[PDB]
Design a protein around this motif. Structure first.
Motif, PDB file in Angstrom:
ATOM      1  N   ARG A  28       4.007  25.752 -37.527  1.00 27.58           N
ATOM      2  CA  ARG A  28       4.825  25.405 -36.364  1.00 27.58           C
ATOM      3  C   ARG A  28       4.767  23.902 -36.053  1.00 27.58           C
ATOM      4  O   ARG A  28       5.784  23.208 -36.127  1.00 27.58           O
ATOM      5  N   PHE A  29       3.591  23.400 -35.701  1.00 30.48           N
ATOM      6  CA  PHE A  29       3.505  22.009 -35.283  1.00 30.48           C
ATOM      7  C   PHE A  29       3.846  21.025 -36.401  1.00 30.48           C
ATOM      8  O   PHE A  29       4.664  20.129 -36.223  1.00 30.48           O
ATOM      9  N   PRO A  49       5.540  21.162 -39.344  1.00 30.96           N
ATOM     10  CA  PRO A  49       6.967  21.057 -39.660  1.00 30.96           C
ATOM     11  C   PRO A  49       7.754  20.278 -38.593  1.00 30.96           C
ATOM     12  O   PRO A  49       8.644  19.483 -38.913  1.00 30.96           O
ATOM     13  N   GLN A  50       7.435  20.508 -37.320  1.00 31.59           N
ATOM     14  CA  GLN A  50       8.190  19.857 -36.254  1.00 31.59           C
ATOM     15  C   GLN A  50       7.868  18.372 -36.127  1.00 31.59           C
ATOM     16  O   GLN A  50       8.763  17.554 -35.909  1.00 31.59           O
ATOM     17  N   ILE A  51       6.600  18.021 -36.262  1.00 33.95           N
ATOM     18  CA  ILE A  51       6.267  16.595 -36.218  1.00 33.95           C
ATOM     19  C   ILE A  51       6.817  15.867 -37.462  1.00 33.95           C
ATOM     20  O   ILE A  51       7.254  14.722 -37.365  1.00 33.95           O
ATOM     21  N   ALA A  65       9.628  16.705 -38.966  1.00 36.04           N
ATOM     22  CA  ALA A  65      11.046  16.510 -38.727  1.00 36.04           C
ATOM     23  C   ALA A  65      11.246  15.261 -37.869  1.00 36.04           C
ATOM     24  O   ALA A  65      12.221  14.524 -38.063  1.00 36.04           O
ATOM     25  N   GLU A  66      10.364  15.046 -36.892  1.00 33.64           N
ATOM     26  CA  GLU A  66      10.497  13.859 -36.062  1.00 33.64           C
ATOM     27  C   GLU A  66      10.262  12.590 -36.897  1.00 33.64           C
ATOM     28  O   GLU A  66      10.970  11.602 -36.720  1.00 33.64           O
ATOM     29  N   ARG A  68      13.381  11.928 -38.688  1.00 37.42           N
ATOM     30  CA  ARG A  68      14.452  11.406 -37.830  1.00 37.42           C
ATOM     31  C   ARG A  68      14.238   9.928 -37.508  1.00 37.42           C
ATOM     32  O   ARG A  68      15.202   9.187 -37.294  1.00 37.42           O
TER      33      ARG A  68
END
Length: 431
Positions: A23-24, A26-28, A30-31, A34
């Protein structure tokens, strides 16, 4: 909220088993993508790196599973690899990579590459080269045996047998929950496994091999082969382990034990359970007290030997991370070798599979990789013995049958049959 800003160091102490890596992370990432930040993700083990391959599906991450030996991208702003892979690259006197974000998953392992990698990442943040994030519920410095968990854990202090038993521990087999049991050695684990299977239990013994299903018992000597998928509700923890330790005023590496483990190691064993917030009452059974008195363990010196030789911008000297800098017997930089010695050190560790401490000794003496004379030049007290207590002799350079007596004594090269036959193959050239 400036976790990704150069110069920041952040420890993220998520409960185990709560999608920190599914969860964490993958999301960090993605940031980071970006923001177009060059990002490095580090794993302590192949098991973790393999899990990352599955979790990052979708993201554009370059995995380096074999070696890290090129610079580039193509939407790959993020590289993922194990600590040793990073270490081997950084041991070449070559090209510093400008990662702006470094994320260390499961940042608590105590092998020399993991310890060195933490010191290296911390230094990059202090140098304002990177933002560094450590993910772990037991960061360096902690000593809580019983930290937080998603679900409530039942902790029980009790005698735990380390060998098969004929009476008096009825509670063990009567509980039918899938169980992980940490034993002090693979020998003890194999012996226990044979016995438990005689008692009609299914058993898996985790060990470094080729292979990788809900058995009654998973036996192991440590948490290295335990991934996110471990299906366990109870842990028994012998709370001991054999360790390579510096003896004789730092002149020799001896294997000693069983020794008590640290509080955070015991916490990580316990932390295999209580991971499901929907299930209270996972149980952790343990006997021996822990110990932080491990500064004579050779891992800390080996981490220093690695870190002092890892190529850094400006060639700055750097200490191990936080309290780990308190564990090593040397001052930062003291183990730095010159370039030619470094190339030898690197090849011995990476390609000859010699322990770090031993490899450093050879390199520091100015000897070459293919020079095997040192294996025969030590004194009689360095004579290696086989499993029946006899002197080992093999083919020294020039072919002659000579007692195996290395100049420097590191018991990891002769600790068992497998290691010994590998050391002999090395001593003999390659045959």
């Amino acid at each position: 909220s400036h976790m990704l800003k150069k110069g920041m160091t952040t420890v993220l102490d998520f409960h185990p088993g709560a999608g920190k890596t599914r969860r964490f992370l993958p999301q960090i990432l993605a940031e980071c993508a970006r923001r177009r930040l060059r990002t490095l993700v580090l794993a302590p083990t192949r098991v973790v790196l393999s899990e990352m391959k599955e979790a990052f599906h979708g993201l554009d991450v370059k995995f380096h599973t074999q070696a890290f030996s090129a610079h580039g991208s193509g939407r790959e702003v993020i590289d993922a690899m194990c600590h040793a892979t990073l270490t081997y690259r950084m041991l070449e006197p070559t090209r510093v990579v400008n990662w702006e974000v470094i994320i260390m998953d499961e940042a608590h392992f105590l092998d020399p590459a993991s310890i060195a990698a933490r010191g290296w990442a911390a230094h990059r943040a202090r140098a304002n080269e990177s933002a560094t994030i450590l993910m772990t519920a037991t960061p360096p410095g902690t000593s809580d045996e019983f930290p937080h968990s998603n679900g409530e854990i039942e902790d029980v202090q009790t005698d735990i047998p380390s060998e098969p038993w004929n009476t008096g521990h009825d509670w063990i087999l009567a509980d039918k929950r899938p169980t992980a049991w940490f034993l002090p050695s693979i020998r003890a684990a194999n012996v226990m496994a044979a016995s438990l299977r005689k008692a009609g239990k299914s058993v898996v013994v985790l060990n470094r091999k080729t292979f990788e299903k809900k058995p009654d018992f998973i036996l192991a000597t440590d948490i290295a082969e335990m991934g996110a998928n471990l299906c366990v509700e109870r842990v028994l923890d012998c709370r001991t382990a054999f360790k390579p330790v510096l003896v004789d005023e730092g002149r020799k590496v001896a294997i000693k034990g069983p020794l008590r483990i640290s509080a955070s190691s015991a916490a990580q064993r316990r932390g295999r359970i209580g991971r499901n917030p929907n299930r209270d009452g996972d149980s952790y059974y343990y006997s021996e007290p822990t110990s932080e008195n491990n500064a004579h363990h050779v891992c800390w010196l080996e981490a220093s030997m690695l870190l002092d030789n890892m190529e850094v911008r400006g060639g700055m000297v750097a200490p191990l991370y936080g309290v780990e800098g308190t564990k090593t017997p040397v001052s930062p930089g003291e183990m730095r070798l010159r370039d030619d010695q470094r190339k030898v050190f690197r090849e011995l560790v990476r390609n000859c599979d010699l322990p770090v401490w031993l490899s450093w000794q050879v390199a520091k003496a100015g000897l070459k990789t293919n020079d095997r004379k040192w294996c025969f030049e030590g004194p009689e007290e360095h004579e290696i013995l086989n499993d029946s207590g006899e002197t080992v002799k093999c083919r020294a350079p020039g072919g002659a049958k000579k007692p195996l007596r290395p100049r420097w004594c590191d018991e990891r090269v002769s600790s068992d049959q497998s290691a010994l036959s590998e050391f002999i193959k090395f001593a003999e050239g390659r045959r």
